[PDB]
Write a protein that binds this DNA or RNA. Sequence first.
RNA 1: UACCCAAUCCCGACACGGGGAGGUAGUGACAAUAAAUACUGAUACAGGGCUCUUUCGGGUCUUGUAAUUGGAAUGAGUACAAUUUAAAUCCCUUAACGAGGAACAAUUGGAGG
Lengths: 120, 48, 378, 74, 159
Amino acid sequence: AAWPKAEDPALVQELLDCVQQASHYRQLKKGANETTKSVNRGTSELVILAADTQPLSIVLHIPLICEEKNVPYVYVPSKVALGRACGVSRAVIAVSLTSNEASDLNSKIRALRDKVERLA
Amino acid sequence: EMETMEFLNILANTGMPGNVFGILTHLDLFKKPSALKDAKKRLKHRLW
Amino acid sequence: KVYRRLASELAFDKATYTQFRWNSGTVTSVAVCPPYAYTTTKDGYLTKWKLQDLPKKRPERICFAKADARKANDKTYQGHLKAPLVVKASQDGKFVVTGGADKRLVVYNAADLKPIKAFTQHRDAVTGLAFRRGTNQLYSCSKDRTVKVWSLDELAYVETLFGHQDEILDIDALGQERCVSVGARDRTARYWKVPEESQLVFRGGGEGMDPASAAHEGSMDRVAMIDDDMFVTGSDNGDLALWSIQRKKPLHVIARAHGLEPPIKLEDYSADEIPDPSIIPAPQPRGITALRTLPYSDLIFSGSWDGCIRVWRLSEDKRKLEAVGILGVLVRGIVNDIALFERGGLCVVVVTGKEMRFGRWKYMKEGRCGAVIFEVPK
Amino acid sequence: GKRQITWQIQKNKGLTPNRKKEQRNPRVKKRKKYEEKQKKLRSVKAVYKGGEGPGGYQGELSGIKTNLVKSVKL
Amino acid sequence: EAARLDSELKLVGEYGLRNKREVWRVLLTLSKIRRAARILLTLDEKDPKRLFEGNALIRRLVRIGVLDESRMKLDYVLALKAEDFLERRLQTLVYKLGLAKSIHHARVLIRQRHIRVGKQIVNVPSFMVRLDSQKHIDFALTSPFGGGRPGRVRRKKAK
RNA sequence: UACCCAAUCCCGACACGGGGAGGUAGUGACAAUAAAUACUGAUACAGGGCUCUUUCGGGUCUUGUAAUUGGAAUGAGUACAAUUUAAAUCCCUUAACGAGGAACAAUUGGAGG
């Protein structure tokens, strides 16, 4: 059901490290409804979705809006790891990290979405 | 003081002699020798 | 500080356990004052307890102290406002220190359990806490990526130490004036020379089953100094790595130290009238949640949420880690903490609950909010 | 009982012209010059300035002109 | 020229600089680094001079955080720029970490001694913060945003 | 036309006496280095602001005000001390004051009404 699944060799941890960097930079929206609202408002640059979700239909409904707006999306295999990487003290199943006109995080964003577009 | 500035411009308007020497006194009425050199510097530059 | 080797002089298959529990949310950490014990529970309790002797297997609680959040406004109240997270006890038996997420670390008398000092020097939260052995010098590493060393004899802060890239999760100390502290997602254990204010970085970058289930080193959760020259770190992809101070690399890393998780059920993963196993994600390794050692010994106690508490040992050249087996040969739940004590032959308490120490990421309906006390007599 | 020297003799101002509070500080002047040259830029080209708001699409809020071709003719 | 004036004004506005001397200072050190990179590209590949000196230059720039850790070639060292240097300045790092509301607020804070880099407070806003030291930018303990005394206008008002 | 043998060194009946080497301080826009002269809100009111190739024509959409108020931050300076030192100074520590323009008072040039 999750066909752009991320594989093991240092791509999941690059994703979660960029997630933690954006959460320190306050450029990140947490949870399914906030990812949905950020994609529909178009400010999203990339969206990470957990794949260990009890029933997967939530992180199945998000890729439709992401494919309609043409933003990259990728599944990491642990919502507990995604919540720990964000710094939430709750398990997060969907993470969308936005765009700003001036940062140094955007280089990591660009390399990450190049790797994700190669993954798709 | 105004008497010092008055004599300086009275002398300059009437006729400037060769040698005028500024003599700065009452330096012992000071407590901080950083304020002392600051006062010497600012009084020297204003006289110049 | 003499070196011991008691990895073979114990009978782990003959361990005697008391798996009890009491009215608590989730117990988090324990310290070992040599007759006593000190529990912290997320309800907001710190309970000082008395252990047992053989020549009745449950402790008798003697006293506790509760966090009072009503007097956050009210001044001259040393003590916590929120629930504490870590506790340590001085080997003198006269000081007990506890730090929580209420941005302050308090320290007081062990006997009457009445708060005497409430340090507010940290800026985010207190995550890790360690004593120098035989001395009242304290090392508290925090969530604002710093670690403050305190001189507790005069009840005073002496020095701070910066340099960690992410939030600092654990710290360990030994008899000298050093530290070893692990930070989470930077994958870094920093060895701390406190008098000259210097550090030594150790960057992990860790590397018939499914291939996508082999996860790299995500965080670096727990740390344990086993002697002066080497320590061990436990990382939430299940990596247990022995590190030497003489070398820049891991000395010996062992992978998936508590195995993989079970793959989640189709009856919860997909809401369909046909459950098909054609699609199900690869399970991830259950990482180390607690990790401890006895100082100057060959004992590596590692506990995850597998329901068992594993024990490892050093090699004869002390340049490798080796398995000696599962200790409880269950102790279900998420192993929050391990504490060790020698009778003269060792009693280890294991602190487990329904979730992890710092956040409610993984709640478990299985497991109990239990201190589980077991000893090996040989 | 001494005659203090006043500020006009203390610093020899003379007849320097009157300048601005913006001109007495070279950073604040270069802040206000950038705010007004970023303002002059919006009146020539079109800045992005956020997409659709949280309220949605309230129409093209300042006119639609039909006979205007604004494409670079290659 | 109008191109130089508009470029320097864009730098002075986008990063809250004081004059064009700071811009020319950064352009001078950037031209020195880029000249060293061009001189190392003059030599052929697998010359030991180019190998060790280019590895030294790239490791230096990655350690001071200007060059990204992804791209580590001498061609990207040639493709370096003054916007990257002024981004590595301290004042824009305070503005981007969000201790201050604007870049001029950040310059004001660094001047009147509120933030600290690591242990010691920093009085200069052009402090080139390295990548390892980027995280430890916070309010000092003697600042009223950090703690201690409630401060000056607070004391005059609370009296 | 500054101060001292206090350190390193030298000479003598000689542990003490004597040293124009040496070290300490002062000036300095000739250069060179870092950077203050402000930061941030709310309300009220006005309807225009800006631009150009092509000009009695075209382009773009939020900008102001000597308006009314509110917050904080404070180093120059003043400065108890202690310290530094041959004795002082500087440095590092440091209690107490220290911002509303009519001021704690930015300048030099050029163009124009």
